[model samples]
Target chain A: KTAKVAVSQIVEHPALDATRQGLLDGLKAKGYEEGKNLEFDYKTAQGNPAIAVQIARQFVGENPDVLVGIATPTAQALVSATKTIPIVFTAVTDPVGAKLVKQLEQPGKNVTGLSDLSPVEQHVELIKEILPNVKSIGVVYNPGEANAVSLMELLKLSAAKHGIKLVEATALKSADVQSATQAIAEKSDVIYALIDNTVASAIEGMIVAANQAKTPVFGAATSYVERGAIASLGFDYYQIGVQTADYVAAILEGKEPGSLDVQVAKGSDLVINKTAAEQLGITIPEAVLARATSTK
Target chain B: KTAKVAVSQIVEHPALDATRQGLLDGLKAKGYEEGKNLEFDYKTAQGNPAIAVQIARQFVGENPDVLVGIATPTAQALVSATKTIPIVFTAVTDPVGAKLVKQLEQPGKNVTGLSDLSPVEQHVELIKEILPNVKSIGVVYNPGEANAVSLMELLKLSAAKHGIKLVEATALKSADVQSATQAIAEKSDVIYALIDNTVASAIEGMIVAANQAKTPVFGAATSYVERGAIASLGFDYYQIGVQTADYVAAILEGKEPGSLDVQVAKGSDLVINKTAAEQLGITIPEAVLARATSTK
Candidate 1:
């Protein structure tokens, strides 16, 4: 069967595009080819919600074999407009809560993709150890990336629950990560970096920026922490990519998208940056030190 | 009967993309419609100079009826690699100097697009007038853009000759423009925005970031000047699109791309921000005010 895929995305930021690329990679790993056997049509809303509606309607009207929507708004609009078309959405944070799926275990409908964050909740906990008396948490994210958008809100909820302030500044591309980090780090005790492609790709800039202000940094990827951040916890985006690719390949292999489980990304690694901790004038707690997979 | 145009660009930035879009719009105006009369295949190198080589080879392999190369490096690479494909290059600064063509008026072979031809030297003279004692001039550019690559060197030569220092920052995509602006703005007396697409697309963000630092931004477009840039010294990007499109149309209409002459975008406009001049504690020069297109 010729798998005709149409992807409508919210914006063209690094992380969101990463999912799109990763999905194609997953499809390719499963033997799908663009010119040899597959027909892929892609469009982006360019960060405009209204265009998301237009793109959603256009792709659904085309009635492709499968439609992949990236991010929350683009997925929501795609789900709202399509019922018969098999849609696999990625780079989204909450499908159940966003009402794109009926339930996580059995979505029971035409939509299923991948949830982003590799568990961002676990990330906030590690940041706490880095800044035990931490008053505010700073997030350097790409606003165009829905993965970061939801992870950001999720972090905000966790921050508010703990009575801490969340200072937010965005770096829309990897090039701006360091300076944006500096801007956001000014009012926070720790800067928590998401595996949003923009921040993570140039994460050294993020660490360098935070270091300039003597603020420790935390992230979800283990290697980033080893590089310079005070710690890395939770799931990495590479893990996010693998899970997402599997789901996409399964749908193409004959499984109904909704019939498949909405697999939340799993796996966790703890890494501590002893030198960065020292630079920030902090000592690692016993609990984190004991569980840490590696420390540098 | 049908126009199958393949475009290989060095990176995805706004101004560069605009030029590509403008060429498409021009093609549409000439009755070439995508999926109908036109098969327009576009690929971006994603800001990697190395990947551009792959894209050029890939597009050349596809053997489209008319091949479009955007920016200098993309065009130069394409011109160097393909001798038979009908090549039309856009967003290029100097075709003759870049060696893409033997001569501007008579391109002589399988390549010709529009020359951005913005008055690079005149821009510096104006900038000097704006900040007479200016010691440092800051620029935000896409390093992959051939137009800016040459223009950047010219700026440096002029800056040194005038006993001023040139500061440079790069934004691979529009999303990085604002932060790049902030970074470059930190050291210069003024920020001169080349007609780079990334900077122009996020021109407002540039204004906001520069505004925070109370530094004025100058451009080569009237629309940017009206939008928030303190002033525009040349015709804006929309003009580049119209000219580029006409060339693409000519190539598609059975006219050999190489036989076509490289056209320069004419019509100069001096648009100024009345309040911005005061914000920088300066006044519009009498010579410029005499030819002012508009002022806000």
Candidate 2:
């Protein structure tokens, strides 16, 4: 019998896109390949919630063997669409917050997934250790996004312990991100780019604004530093997908999704953009530079 | 000399509206009445940065004796529009960050006014003191906003001390606030209504979602508590306007704006919404209830 896996994504940003690819590579290793014993379907919402809901309903009608949701909004759409489809979600920050699973351990539901609760607390520590002068950390986010909001909550708790003040700005759409960043950059010692879909989707705009203001930016995802943030202590989204594949493979191979326990996405990396730091008048400490996984 | 004052606001929310009325009243108390000695021109951008810039330019061209910017964005636009005009900014969190002034002690520029840095640390303590089981505090904001971001940073530092985890969601617009609130409510024990222009503009939507989830919300401003939040220990924005009028009067009376110190907005009140607390299944402590400025 042929097995089918369908995936829905909120938007095609680098991190989410990596997770999608890593999921496929992982599934391939598990002996599930398209054009063979598997049929795969992939679609994106293009950042529209209604379209995400429509995609979920359309997928439900076809009755795929296993349905996968890549991000929080898309995953929420899938979970809302069906309770018996054996749904698996990845790249989501809080599965319980989204109401995808009742709890982290032994979810005991038709839904199971992974949490990308980006190491916000640890990153706050890194900011303190690296930039001793940065007493205030500013971030811009969309208050409408669940994952972004969850990270902000975690960020506040962590920044407080270190005596670091957190600053925030709100941009409802990508087009408005630059103005928001400009407004905050003037007010903050440094900017912490949260691994938010709305912010991540418009990372370039934020980078340009922060750079112009000569303000240093640290990201919650390694990809952000690569795109121009000063530094990042965060996850490898691709590994998150590979780890997610372990669940998708097991569920497809006769393991019930409800029987699986939710997990945190695997792998963490420290990336520093030396050039970006220099442009913003910040110098990476030699010790931090040496231990970094990648420095540009 | 006939006195002329031009006011430019970002949007017309309750707190901001109160600030404007208070400015007029405060000005009137100083013997400057509209249509008599005061020639007042009031304009609002209606939440558009471009329009804010245009208004700033239009005001600069007219050369009002004192130009007033009511919020962060409007203040920034005014600061950018002219350096020669005597400008007074109110309801701003960080004058230095917004590049409106060089320092708080003595702004030594054409700009000097009031900073409405909300009593965030005390609010965190209040949340902990009132609701002992509330481990996670959730908030929804637009990351693109300067004042909101500043508050988030402060909230994080404060919440950490209380051992409270912060949860966040993003809503770029008022329409999406409910969904964002719903997503975070599932994951948070309580929500904090920040005095953000975007979020405050749609506070009712957030209240509806938080209520359905039975989550108690705390306000950063007294007005939020009046609308639906359980409690608030924050500035009276009208008083903020009254305080702002002090700077405007000083400038109009031939005192240079640069000679004055940028002051923090004055007065704090503790407001409790007893009915809202009950609807959200919360009980106000008897001791705490006695000291409240208003409870309804």
Candidate 3:
């Protein structure tokens, strides 16, 4: 019998796309090559959760040996589809909050993959590095997405600890990103984008609005810099993708999804985008660049 | 029981991403929706064929219900990985020429996919529409790709039929696209790009060079029009992705991939880039505009 794996995603964004690429490369780097003894299936919901549900149902009908989901909504959809199929979820902010898994240390059932929880503390520190006089942080997110809601909890506390007041805008769709961003930018010193699917897929809309206000934006993923966010401290979703290979190979090696604890990402890279920073009248701190993984 | 599907693509170009999306959406339109019952796995080779081969081995390792390859190189890698697993490929230029399948209709063994042979004749007509006085058509492609080579033959015949000469430049990597495009721009009346992976991935390079030379470029993929090409006759990759779902579902329904005839996309939509045409000092004829699906 052949080992079969299927992955479903919420949408096709650059960071999510990178994570998928990183996952495959990381898998191959760890010795799980695709064609030698594997059958792989890949899909995306094209940003529609309803379609995601349909894709989940379709995958269940196919009955893959193992299933992987990207983003919270897609993971939740897959979780709803199969109770017994081993499910690995990635690019999710809060698996536990989303109820895809019972706990991070022990998933307890048929779902586990990687947790892309935002390192809010590091993000705050980077903000401090660039703007020592910063007094407030603005965040844009979708309250409907459980992942965004969870990251908001982390950001609120992290901001308080850093002595910055938090301003937030609730943008639930692409149409709302610009208005939400400008509203927050009006009174905030900085903008932060949570690793929410809605916000990530619509990062450009916010970027346009952020520049209109001359407010610097920091994003949750490393790939955010390229998309116009000025600076960020995050994991290379590529690295996370690679990290996933370890868990997937284990499952294929007979480790049940329930037996596997969810993987918490361990490293963060500092990325500074020169063009974006300049567009918003921000200066790159030399010290920050010294420890930077890349300056775009 | 669920059928496991694994998809691997060359990289994250918009057209390729759309193809992947189309395949999943196409599957759903036919009744296979994810959470409803499907296990789908998607991965990327990150634009490296070496990584593609590694991806191939990884997919083979997991042993999926079906495997998908998004481009010629990735398909070639999968072809080398397993003889038994059913494999379907899309967006490829020439599957038979690449030997991923024995023949387009029969496929012989375990592989089948759609051919992305550019509708070169349509592309020529688009060029003629935009630049009625054109005498030579410039093209940039990767000769290493069989799809580009096969389409080049059709392009040559089409060019001759229009009483135009062909100007060509070969790009093997993204870095070479600008030079390839500019080199031909000096002697050609306009530029035309095929759905060649290399050329498309670096379409911006050619676009930049074309702008510098004031030569209009006609692209074979719809996304190209948005990326600065003067015009294109391409359907959305979503449609192609949707079309792929039919075959993917049939295979999951217990039909053999080899038994299915390869689908050569039957039709395409006309898209024009008025912004690009303006940049090139060209005016779109009213007859072309009346028939265009969109004008950017």
Task: Give per-residue CA lDDT, model 2, range B64-109, as digits (tens).
Answer: 7999999898999999999989999999987776788888987888
DockQ of predicted candidate 1: 0.02
TM-score of each: 0.48, 0.50, 0.55
In candidate 3, stretches whose alpha carbon ends up further than 4 angstroms from where it belongs are A1-296, B29-36
Query: Which candidate model has the greater TM-score, 1 or 2?
Result: 2
Looking at candidate 2 chain B, the ten consecutive residues that score lowest on lDDT are: B33-42
lDDT of 1 at A112: 82
Per-residue error for B127 in candidate 1, Å, reads 2.7
Residue B112 deviation, candidate 1, in Å?
1.4
C-alpha DockQ of every model: 0.02, 0.00, 0.07
lDDT of 2: 0.85
lDDT of each: 0.74, 0.85, 0.82
Highest TM-score among the candidates is held by which one?
3
Fnat: each model in turn: 0.00, 0.00, 0.10
Residue A120, candidate 1: Cα error in Å is 49
Tens digits of lDDT, candidate 1, B114-149: 777778678778778766777887889987565677
* CAPRI-style grade of the A/B interface in model 2: incorrect
Each candidate's chain B TM-score? 0.77, 0.96, 0.94
